[PDB]
Coordinates of C-alpha atoms in Angstrom, one line a residue:
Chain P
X1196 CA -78.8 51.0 14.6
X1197 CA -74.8 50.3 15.0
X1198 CA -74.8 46.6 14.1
X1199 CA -74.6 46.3 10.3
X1200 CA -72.4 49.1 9.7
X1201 CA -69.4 46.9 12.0
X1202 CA -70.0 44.3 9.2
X1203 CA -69.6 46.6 6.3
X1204 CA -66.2 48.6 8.1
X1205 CA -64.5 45.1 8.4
X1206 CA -65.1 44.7 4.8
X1207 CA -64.0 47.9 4.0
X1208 CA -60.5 47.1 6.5
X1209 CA -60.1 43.8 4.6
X1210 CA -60.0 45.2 1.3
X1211 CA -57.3 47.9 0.8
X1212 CA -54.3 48.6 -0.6
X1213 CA -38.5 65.4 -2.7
X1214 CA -35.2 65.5 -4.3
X1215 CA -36.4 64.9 -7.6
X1216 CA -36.5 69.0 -8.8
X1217 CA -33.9 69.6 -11.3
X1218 CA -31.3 72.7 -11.1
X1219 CA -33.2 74.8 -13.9
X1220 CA -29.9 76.5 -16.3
X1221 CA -31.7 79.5 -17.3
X1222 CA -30.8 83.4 -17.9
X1223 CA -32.8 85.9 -16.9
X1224 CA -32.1 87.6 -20.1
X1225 CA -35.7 88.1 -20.9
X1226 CA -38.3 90.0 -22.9
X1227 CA -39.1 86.4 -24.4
X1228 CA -38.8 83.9 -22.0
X1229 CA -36.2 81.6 -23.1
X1230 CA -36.2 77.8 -21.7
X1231 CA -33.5 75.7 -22.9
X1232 CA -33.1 73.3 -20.1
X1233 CA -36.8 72.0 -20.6
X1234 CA -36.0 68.7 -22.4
X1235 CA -33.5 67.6 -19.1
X1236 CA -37.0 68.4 -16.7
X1237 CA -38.7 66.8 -19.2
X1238 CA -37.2 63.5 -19.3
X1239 CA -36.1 63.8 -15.4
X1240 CA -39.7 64.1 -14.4
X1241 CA -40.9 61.6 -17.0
X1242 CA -42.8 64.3 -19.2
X1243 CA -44.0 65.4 -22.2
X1244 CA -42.4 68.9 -22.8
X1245 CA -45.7 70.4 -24.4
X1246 CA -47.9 69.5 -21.0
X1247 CA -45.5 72.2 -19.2
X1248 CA -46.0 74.5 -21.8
X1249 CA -49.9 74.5 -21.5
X1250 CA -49.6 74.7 -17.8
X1251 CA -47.2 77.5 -18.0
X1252 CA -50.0 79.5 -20.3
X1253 CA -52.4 78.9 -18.0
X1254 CA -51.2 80.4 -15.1
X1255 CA -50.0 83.5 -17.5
X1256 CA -50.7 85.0 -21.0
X1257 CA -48.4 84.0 -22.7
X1258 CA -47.9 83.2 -26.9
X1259 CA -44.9 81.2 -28.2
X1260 CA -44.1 77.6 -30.4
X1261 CA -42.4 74.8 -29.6
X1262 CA -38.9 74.2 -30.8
X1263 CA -36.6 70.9 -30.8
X1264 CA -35.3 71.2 -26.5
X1265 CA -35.8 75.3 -26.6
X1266 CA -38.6 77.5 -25.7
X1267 CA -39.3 80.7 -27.5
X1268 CA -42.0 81.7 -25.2
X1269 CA -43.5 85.4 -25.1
X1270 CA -42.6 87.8 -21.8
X1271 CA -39.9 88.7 -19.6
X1272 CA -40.4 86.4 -16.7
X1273 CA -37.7 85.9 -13.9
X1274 CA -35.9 82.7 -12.3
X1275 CA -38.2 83.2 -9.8
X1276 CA -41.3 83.4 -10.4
X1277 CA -40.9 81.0 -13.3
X1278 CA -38.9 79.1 -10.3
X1279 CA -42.2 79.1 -8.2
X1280 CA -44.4 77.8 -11.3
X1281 CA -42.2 74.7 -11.6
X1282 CA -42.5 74.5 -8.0
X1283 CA -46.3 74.0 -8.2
X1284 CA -46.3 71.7 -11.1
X1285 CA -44.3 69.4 -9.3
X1286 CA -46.2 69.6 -5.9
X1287 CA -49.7 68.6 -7.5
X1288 CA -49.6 67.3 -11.0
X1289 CA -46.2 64.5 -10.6
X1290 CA -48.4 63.8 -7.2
X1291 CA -51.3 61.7 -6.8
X1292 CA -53.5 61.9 -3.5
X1293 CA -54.6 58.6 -3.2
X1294 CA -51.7 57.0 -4.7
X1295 CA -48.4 58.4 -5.4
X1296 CA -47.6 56.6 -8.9
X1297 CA -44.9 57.5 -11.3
X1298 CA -47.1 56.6 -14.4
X1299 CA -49.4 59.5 -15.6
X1300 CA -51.0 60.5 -18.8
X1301 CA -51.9 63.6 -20.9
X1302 CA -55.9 63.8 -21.9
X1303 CA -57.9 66.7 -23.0
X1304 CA -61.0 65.9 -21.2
X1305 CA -64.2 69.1 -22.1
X1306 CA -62.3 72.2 -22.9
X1307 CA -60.5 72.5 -19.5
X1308 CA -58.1 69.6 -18.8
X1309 CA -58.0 66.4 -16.8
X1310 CA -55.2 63.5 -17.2
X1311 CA -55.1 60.4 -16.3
X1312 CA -53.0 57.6 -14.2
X1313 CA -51.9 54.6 -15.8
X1314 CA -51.7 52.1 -12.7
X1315 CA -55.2 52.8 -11.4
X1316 CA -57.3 55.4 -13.8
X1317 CA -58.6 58.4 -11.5
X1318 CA -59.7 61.9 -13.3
X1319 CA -57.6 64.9 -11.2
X1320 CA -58.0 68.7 -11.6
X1321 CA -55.5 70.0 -14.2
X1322 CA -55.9 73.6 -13.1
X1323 CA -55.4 73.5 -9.7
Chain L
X1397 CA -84.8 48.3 -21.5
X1398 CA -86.9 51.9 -21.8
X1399 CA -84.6 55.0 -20.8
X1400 CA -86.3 56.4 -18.0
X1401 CA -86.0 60.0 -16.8
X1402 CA -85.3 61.0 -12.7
X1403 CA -87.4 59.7 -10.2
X1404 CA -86.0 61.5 -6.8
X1405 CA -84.0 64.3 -5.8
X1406 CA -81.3 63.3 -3.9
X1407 CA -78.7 65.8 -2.3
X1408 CA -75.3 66.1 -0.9
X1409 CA -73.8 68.2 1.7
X1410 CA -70.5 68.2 3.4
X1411 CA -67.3 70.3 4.2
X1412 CA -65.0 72.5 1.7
X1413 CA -61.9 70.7 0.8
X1414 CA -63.6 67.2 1.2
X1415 CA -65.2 65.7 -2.2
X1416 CA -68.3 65.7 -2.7
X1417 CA -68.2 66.0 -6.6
X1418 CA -65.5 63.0 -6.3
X1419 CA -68.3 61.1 -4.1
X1420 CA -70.7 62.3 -6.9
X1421 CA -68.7 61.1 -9.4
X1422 CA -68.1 57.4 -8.0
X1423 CA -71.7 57.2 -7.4
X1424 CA -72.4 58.3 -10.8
X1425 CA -70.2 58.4 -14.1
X1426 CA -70.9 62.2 -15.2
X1427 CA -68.7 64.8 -14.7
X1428 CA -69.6 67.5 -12.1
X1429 CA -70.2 71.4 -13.8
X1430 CA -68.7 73.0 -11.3
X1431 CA -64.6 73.7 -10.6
X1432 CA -68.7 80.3 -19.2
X1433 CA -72.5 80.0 -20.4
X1434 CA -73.3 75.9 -20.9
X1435 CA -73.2 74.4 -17.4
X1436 CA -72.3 77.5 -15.3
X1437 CA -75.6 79.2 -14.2
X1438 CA -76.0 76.5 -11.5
X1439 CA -74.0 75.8 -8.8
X1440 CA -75.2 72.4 -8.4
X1441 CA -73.0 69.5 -9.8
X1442 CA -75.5 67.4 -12.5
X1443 CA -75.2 63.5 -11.6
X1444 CA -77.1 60.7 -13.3
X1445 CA -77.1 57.6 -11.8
X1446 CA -78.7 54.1 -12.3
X1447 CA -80.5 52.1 -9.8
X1448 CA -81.4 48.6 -11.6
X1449 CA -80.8 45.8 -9.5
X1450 CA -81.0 42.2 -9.8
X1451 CA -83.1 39.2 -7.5
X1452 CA -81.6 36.3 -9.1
X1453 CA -78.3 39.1 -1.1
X1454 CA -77.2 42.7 1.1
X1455 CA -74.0 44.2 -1.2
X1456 CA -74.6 41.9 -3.6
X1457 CA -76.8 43.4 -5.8
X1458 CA -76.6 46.9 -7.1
X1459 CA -74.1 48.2 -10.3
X1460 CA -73.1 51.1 -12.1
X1461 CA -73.7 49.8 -15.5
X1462 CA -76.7 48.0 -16.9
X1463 CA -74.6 45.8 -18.3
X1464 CA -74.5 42.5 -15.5
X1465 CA -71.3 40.4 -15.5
X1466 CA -69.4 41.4 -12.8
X1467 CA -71.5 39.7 -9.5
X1468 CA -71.1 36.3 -11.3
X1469 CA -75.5 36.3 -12.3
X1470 CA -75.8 35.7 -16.3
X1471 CA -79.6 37.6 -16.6
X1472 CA -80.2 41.0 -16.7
X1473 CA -80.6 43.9 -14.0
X1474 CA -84.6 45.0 -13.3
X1475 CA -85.6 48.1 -13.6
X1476 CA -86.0 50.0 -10.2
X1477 CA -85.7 53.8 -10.3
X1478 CA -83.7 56.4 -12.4
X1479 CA -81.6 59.3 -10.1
X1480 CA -80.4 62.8 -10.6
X1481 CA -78.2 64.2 -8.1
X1482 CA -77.5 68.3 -6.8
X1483 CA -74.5 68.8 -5.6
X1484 CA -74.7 71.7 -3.5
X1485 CA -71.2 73.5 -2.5
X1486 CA -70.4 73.8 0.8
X1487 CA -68.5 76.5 1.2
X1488 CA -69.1 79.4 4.0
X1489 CA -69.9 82.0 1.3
X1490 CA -72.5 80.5 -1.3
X1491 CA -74.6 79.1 1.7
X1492 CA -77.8 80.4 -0.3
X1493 CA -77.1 78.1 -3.4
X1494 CA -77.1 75.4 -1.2
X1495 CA -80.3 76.7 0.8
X1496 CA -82.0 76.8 -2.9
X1497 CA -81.1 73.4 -3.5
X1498 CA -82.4 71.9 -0.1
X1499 CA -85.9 72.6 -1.2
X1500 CA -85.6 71.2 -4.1
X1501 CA -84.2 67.7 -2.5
X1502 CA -86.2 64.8 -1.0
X1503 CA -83.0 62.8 0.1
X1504 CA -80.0 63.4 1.8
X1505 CA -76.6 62.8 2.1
X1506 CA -74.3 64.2 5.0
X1507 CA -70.4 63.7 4.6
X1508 CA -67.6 63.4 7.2
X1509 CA -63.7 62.8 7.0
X1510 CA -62.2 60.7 9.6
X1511 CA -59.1 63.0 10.2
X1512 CA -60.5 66.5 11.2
X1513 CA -62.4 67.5 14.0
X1514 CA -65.4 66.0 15.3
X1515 CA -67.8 68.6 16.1
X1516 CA -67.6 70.3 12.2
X1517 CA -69.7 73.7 12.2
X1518 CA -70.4 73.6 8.4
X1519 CA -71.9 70.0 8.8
X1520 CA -74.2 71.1 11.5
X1521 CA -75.5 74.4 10.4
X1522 CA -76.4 71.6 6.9
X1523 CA -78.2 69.5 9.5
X1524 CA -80.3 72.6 11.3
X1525 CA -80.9 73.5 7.2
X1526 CA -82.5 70.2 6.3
X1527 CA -84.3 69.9 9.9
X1528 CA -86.2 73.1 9.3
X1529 CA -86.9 72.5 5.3
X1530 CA -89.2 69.2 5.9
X1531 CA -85.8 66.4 4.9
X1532 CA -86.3 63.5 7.8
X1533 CA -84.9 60.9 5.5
X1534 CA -81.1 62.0 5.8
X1535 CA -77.8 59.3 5.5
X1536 CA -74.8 59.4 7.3
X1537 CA -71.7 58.7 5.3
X1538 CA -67.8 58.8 5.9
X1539 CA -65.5 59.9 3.7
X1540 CA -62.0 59.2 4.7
X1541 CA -60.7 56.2 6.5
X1542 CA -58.1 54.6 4.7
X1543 CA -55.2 57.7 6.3
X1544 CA -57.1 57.0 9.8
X1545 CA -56.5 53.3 12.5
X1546 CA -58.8 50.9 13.2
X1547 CA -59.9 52.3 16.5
X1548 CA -60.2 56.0 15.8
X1549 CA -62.8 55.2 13.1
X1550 CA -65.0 53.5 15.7
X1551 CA -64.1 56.5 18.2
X1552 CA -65.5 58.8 15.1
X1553 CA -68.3 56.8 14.9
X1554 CA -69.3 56.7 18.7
X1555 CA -68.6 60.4 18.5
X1556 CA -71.3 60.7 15.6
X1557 CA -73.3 58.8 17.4
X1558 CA -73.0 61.0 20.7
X1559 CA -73.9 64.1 18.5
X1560 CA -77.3 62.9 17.0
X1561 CA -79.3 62.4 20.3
X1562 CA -81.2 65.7 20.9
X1563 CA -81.9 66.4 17.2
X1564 CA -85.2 66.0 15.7
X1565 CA -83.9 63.2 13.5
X1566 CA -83.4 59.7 15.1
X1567 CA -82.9 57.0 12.7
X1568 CA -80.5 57.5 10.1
X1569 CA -78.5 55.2 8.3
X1570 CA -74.3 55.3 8.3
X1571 CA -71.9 54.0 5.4
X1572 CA -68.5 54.2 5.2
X1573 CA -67.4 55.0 1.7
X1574 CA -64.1 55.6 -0.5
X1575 CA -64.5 58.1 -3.8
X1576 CA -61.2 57.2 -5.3
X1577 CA -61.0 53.3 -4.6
X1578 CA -64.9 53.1 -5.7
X1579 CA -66.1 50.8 -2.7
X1580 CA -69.1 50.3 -1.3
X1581 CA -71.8 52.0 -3.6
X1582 CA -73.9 48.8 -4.2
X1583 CA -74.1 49.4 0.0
X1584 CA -75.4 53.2 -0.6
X1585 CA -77.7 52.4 -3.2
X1586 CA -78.9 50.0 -1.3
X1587 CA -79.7 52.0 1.7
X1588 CA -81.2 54.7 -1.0
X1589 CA -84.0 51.9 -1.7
X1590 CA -84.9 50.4 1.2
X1591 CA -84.7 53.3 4.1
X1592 CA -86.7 56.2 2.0
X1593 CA -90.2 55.8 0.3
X1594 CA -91.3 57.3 -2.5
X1595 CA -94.1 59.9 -2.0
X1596 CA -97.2 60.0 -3.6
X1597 CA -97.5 62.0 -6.5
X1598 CA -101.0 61.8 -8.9
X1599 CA -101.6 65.0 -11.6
X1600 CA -104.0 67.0 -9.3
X1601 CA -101.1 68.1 -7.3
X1602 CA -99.8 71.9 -7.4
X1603 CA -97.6 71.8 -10.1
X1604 CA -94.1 73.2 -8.5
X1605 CA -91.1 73.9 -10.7
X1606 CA -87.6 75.7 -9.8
X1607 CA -85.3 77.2 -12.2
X1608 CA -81.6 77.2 -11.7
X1609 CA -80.2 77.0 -15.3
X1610 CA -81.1 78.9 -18.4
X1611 CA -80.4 77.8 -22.3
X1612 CA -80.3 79.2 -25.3
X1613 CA -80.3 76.4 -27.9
X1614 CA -79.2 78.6 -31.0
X1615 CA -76.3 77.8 -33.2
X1616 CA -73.3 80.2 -34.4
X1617 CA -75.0 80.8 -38.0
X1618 CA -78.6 80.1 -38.3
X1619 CA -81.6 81.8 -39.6
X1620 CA -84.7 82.9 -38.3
X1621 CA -87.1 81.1 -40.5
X1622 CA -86.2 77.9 -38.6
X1623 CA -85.6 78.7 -34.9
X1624 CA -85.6 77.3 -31.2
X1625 CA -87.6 78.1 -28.3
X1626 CA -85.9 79.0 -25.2
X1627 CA -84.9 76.3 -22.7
X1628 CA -85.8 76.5 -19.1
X1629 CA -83.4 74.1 -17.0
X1630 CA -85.3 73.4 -14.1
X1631 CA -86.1 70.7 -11.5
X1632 CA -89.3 69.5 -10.2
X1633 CA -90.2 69.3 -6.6
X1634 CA -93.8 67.9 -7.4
X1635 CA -96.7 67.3 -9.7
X1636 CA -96.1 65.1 -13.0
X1637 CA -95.7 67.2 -16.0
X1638 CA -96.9 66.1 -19.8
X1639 CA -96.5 68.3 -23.3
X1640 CA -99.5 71.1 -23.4
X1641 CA -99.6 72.7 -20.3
X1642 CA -99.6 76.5 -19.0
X1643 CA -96.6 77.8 -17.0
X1644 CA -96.0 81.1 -15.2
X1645 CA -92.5 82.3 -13.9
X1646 CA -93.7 84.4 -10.7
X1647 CA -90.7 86.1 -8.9
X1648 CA -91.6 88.9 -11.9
X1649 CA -89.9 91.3 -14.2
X1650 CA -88.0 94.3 -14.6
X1651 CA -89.1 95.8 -18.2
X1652 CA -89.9 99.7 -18.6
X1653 CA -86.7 101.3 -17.6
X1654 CA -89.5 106.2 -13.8
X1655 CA -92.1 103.4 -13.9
X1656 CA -94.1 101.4 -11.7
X1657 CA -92.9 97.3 -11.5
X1658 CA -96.7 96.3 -11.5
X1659 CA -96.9 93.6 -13.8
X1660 CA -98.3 89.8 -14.3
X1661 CA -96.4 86.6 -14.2
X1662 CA -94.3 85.4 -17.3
X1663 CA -96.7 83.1 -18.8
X1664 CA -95.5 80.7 -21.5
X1665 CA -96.6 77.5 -23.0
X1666 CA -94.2 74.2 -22.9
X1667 CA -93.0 73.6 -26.4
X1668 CA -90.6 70.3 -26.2
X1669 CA -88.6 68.7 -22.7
X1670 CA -85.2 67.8 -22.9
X1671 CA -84.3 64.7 -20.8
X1672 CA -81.3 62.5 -20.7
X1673 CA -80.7 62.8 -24.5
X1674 CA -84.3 62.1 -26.9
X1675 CA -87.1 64.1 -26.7
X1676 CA -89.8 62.3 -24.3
X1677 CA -93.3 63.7 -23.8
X1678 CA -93.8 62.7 -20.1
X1679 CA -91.5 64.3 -17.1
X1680 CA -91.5 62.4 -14.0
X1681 CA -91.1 64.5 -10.5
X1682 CA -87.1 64.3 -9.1
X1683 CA -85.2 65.5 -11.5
X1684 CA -83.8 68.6 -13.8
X1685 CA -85.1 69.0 -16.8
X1686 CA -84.7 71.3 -19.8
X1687 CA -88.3 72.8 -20.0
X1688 CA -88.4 74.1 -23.3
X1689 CA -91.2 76.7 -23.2
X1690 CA -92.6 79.7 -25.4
X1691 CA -89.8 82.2 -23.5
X1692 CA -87.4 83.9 -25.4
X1693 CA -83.7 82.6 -26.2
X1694 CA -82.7 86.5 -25.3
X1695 CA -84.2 86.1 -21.0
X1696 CA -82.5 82.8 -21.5
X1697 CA -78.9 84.3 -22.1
X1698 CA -76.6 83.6 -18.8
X1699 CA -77.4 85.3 -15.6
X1700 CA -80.9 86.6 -15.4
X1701 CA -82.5 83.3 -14.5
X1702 CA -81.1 82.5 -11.0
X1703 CA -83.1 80.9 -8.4
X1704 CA -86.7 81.8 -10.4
X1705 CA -90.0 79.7 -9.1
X1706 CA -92.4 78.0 -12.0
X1707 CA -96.0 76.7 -11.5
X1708 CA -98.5 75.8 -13.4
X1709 CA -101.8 77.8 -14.3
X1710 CA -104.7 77.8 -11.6
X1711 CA -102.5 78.5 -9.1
X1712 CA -101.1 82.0 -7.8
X1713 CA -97.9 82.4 -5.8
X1714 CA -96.2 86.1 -5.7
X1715 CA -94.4 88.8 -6.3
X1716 CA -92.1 89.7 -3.0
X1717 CA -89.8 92.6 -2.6
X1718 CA -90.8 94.0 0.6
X1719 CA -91.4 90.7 2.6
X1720 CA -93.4 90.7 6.4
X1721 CA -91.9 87.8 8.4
X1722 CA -93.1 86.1 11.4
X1723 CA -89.3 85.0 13.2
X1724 CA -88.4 82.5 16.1
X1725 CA -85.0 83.1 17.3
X1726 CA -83.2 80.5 19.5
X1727 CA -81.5 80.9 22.9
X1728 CA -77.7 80.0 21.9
X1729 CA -75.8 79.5 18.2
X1730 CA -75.3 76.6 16.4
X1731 CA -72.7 75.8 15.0
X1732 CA -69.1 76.7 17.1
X1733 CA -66.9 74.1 17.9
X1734 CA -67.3 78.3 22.0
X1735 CA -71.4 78.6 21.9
X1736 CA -72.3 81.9 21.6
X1737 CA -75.8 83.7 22.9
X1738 CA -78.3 84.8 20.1
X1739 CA -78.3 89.3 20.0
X1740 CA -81.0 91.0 18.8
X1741 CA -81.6 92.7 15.2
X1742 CA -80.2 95.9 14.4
X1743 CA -81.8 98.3 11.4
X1744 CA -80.2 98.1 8.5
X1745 CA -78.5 95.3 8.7
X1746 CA -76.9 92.5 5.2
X1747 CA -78.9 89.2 6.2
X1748 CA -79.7 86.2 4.0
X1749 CA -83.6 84.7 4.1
X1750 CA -84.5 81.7 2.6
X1751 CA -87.6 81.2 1.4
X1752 CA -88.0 77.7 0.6
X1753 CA -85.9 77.7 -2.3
X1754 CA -85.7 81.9 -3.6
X1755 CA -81.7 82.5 -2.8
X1756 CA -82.2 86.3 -1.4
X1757 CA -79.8 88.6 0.9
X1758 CA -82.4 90.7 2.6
X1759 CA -82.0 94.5 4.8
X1760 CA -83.9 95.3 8.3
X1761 CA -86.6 98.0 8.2
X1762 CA -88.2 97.3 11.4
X1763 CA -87.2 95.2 14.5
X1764 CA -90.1 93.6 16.7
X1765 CA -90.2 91.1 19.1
X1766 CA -91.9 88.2 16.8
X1767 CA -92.2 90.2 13.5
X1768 CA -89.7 91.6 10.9
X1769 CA -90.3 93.7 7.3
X1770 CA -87.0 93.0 5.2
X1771 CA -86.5 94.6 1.9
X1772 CA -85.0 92.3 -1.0
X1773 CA -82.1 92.8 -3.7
X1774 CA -83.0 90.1 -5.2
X1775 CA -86.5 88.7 -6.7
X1776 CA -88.0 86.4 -3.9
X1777 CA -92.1 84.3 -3.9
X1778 CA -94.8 83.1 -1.7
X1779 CA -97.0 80.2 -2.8
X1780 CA -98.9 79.8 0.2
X1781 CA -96.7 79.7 3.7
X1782 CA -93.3 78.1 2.9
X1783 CA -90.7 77.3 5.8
X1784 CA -87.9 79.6 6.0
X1785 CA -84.4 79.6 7.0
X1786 CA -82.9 82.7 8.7
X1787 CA -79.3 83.3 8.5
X1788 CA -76.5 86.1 9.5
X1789 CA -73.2 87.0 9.4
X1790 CA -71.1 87.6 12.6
X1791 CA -67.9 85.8 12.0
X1792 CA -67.0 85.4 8.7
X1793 CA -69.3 83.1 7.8
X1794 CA -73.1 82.7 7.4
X1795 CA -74.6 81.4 10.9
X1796 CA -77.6 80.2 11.8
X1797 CA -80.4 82.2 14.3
X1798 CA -83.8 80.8 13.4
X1799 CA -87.0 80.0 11.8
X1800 CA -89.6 82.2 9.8
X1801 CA -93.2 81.9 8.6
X1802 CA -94.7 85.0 5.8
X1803 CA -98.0 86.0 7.6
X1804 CA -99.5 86.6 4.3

């Protein structure tokens, strides 16, 4: 039976609702993977610098601190490669699929992690 | 009121790429396990849900939360049934994981977007799965409509619509849904009541237990004078289980290692069950359930329990290596968006049999015109007929050919 269903998709019809990748001033000059450009993608992006970091170590093994602005970061990785990585981060974790909002927020939610978005509250894969 | 455990398995199956765990989860409120040893042995998603609704009209009604306030009603929700949900994946490679899981289920649930094609091969191949393995009572939901017009959606629907005609099943339900807006639930769980009833179940049925997880409930640091069983985490098809019963794991055991694998069943006695979060001494049928039994926390360790069939004593299914097969193949394939005509079985030959729920990939001995002997990689079990689901790979994927009975 088709009949109820019309009811409930009228319901559903009533109630509803990039130039922004900075230049990244880097040198190659490597064997540890210096990144002092961060803080500008940081605050450009509206970011805390420390999220990048965690993503970066995900994708490679990698071992470093945090420094205030500068990265001391363990590797010789290129401006590339690196390039491509900040690529990604800003194709799916600035960007929201059902929404795409500006306001988003760091949780570690158990050991693998999952942020959240301030102007609704939706749980997306921090990994891939 | 009481915390009460599962009372019906209900299922989900759908496309890759989709959201069924996001479906899951705006059903629900749990976290999916899926996407190293706690919550990775299964490949099914662990859901609980709550079905409490109040009579104080339609949508109206059902809630996440026990808690009533939202509808505008001051009293309380009633208690109506407790749900567990198995999300299986539906990818074209693990197809046996969610073969395992259609056994277990009693319910389910069929997802479609809105904005790929219309005739899906996945989705179908799901449907021919759950025609074959006894699952009349399936519901029709879509996924995506928001991205999609006004007029396509009911051109997706008539579609639908066109498509379920020649099937076995004729009267199934259809609810459109949103994951990430959380719409339209009270709708689903509505449907969940009213369209499927409960079967009867006494305690003089044939006790039927499968295990997909395994646990080892020991912590970093403790001594032997005050130890843990070993956890079985398995779901129950049928047959009400209490504390003080007799359980044998049947698809056997690989222990002398020269030497002959004739052995008994792993008999063990149940020591405590592990539901929702205290210790209860009744398990009602739907639902997994940490079985903690008189096995060993070392066979419960993280992949050596995979797909492994429990039942109670007085009851004798089997051992199956070498398994004789009585196949009915079909004239064309289903599930091609360009039909294809059904070949004939070549020795030696990778295929994957289903039986009932035992995930096994299975090689051709002999090729006859109704019967086949396949040998198994994998530990597989007869209770007493048990449909089977036959399927081969010719194109990438896993595909469909046919049913099977074990002439045994």
């Amino acid at each position: 039976v088709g009949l109820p269903y019309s009811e409930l998709l009228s319901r559903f019809f009533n109630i509803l609702r990039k130039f922004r990748i900075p230049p990244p001033v880097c040198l190659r000059d490597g064997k540890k993977t210096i990144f002092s450009n961060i803080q500008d993608i940081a605050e450009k992006l509206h970011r805390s610098p420390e999220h990048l970091i965690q993503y970066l170590f995900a994708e490679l093994g990698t071992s470093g601190s945090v420094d205030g602005k500068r990265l001391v970061i363990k590797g010789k990785f290129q401006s590339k490669q690196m390039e491509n990585v900040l690529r990604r981060y800003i194709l799916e974790y600035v960007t929201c699929k059902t929404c795409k909002s500006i306001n988003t927020e760091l949780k570690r939610e158990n050991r693998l992690f999952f942020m959240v978005c301030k102007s609704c509250g939706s749980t997306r894969s921090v990994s891939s | 009121i009481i915390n009460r455990q599962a009372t019906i398995n209900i299922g989900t199956i759908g496309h890759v790429a989709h959201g069924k765990s996001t479906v899951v989860r705006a059903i629900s409120g749990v976290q999916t396990v899926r996407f190293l040893e706690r919550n990775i042995t299964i490949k099914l998603g662990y859901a609980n849900a709550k079905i409490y609704k109040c009579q104080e009209s339609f949508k109206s009604d059902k809630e996440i939360s026990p808690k009533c306030q939202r509808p505008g009603c001051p009293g309380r929700y009633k208690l109506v049934r407790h749900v567990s949900f198995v999300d299986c994946p539906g990818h074209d490679i693990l197809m046996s994981t969610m073969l395992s899981g259609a056994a277990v289920m009693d319910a389910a649930l069929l997802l479609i977007a809105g904005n790929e094609s219309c005739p899906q091969p996945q989705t179908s191949e799901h449907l021919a799965a759950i025609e074959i393995m006894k699952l009349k009572h399936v519901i029709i939901l879509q996924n995506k409509v928001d991205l999609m017009r006004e007029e396509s959606a009911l051109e997706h629907q008539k579609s639908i619509l066109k498509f379920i005609r020649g099937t076995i099943a004729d009267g199934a339900p259809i609810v459109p849904i949103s994951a990430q807006l959380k719409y339209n639930i009270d709708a689903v769980n509505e449907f969940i009541v009213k369209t499927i009833p409960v079967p009867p179940r006494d305690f003089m049925i044939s006790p039927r237990l499968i295990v997909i997880r395994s646990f080892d409930v020991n912590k970093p640091g403790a001594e032997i004078e005050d130890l843990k069983g070993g956890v079985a985490g398995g779901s129950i098809l049928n047959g009400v289980f209490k504390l003080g019963d007799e359980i044998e794991i049947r698809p056997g055991i690989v222990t002398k290692d020269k030497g002959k694998i004739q052995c008994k069943p792993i008999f063990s006695n149940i020591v405590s069950l592990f539901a929702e979060q205290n210790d209860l001494k009744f398990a009602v049928p739907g639902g997994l359930i940490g079985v903690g039994t008189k096995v060993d926390p070392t066979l419960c360790r993280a992949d050596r329990l995979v797909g492994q069939v429990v039942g109670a004593k007085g009851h004798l299914p089997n051992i199956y290596t070498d398994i004789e097969i009585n196949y009915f193949l079909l004239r064309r394939l289903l599930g091609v968006k360009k039909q294809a005509k059904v070949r004939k079985l070549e020795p030696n030959e990778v295929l994957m049999v289903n039986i009932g729920s035992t995930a096994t990939g299975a090689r051709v001995v002999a090729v006859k015109a109704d019967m086949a002997r396949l040998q198994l990689t994998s530990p597989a079990c007869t209770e007493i007929n048990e449909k089977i689901a036959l399927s081969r790979r010719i194109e990438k994927h896993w595909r469909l050919i046919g049913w099977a009975t074990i002439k045994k």
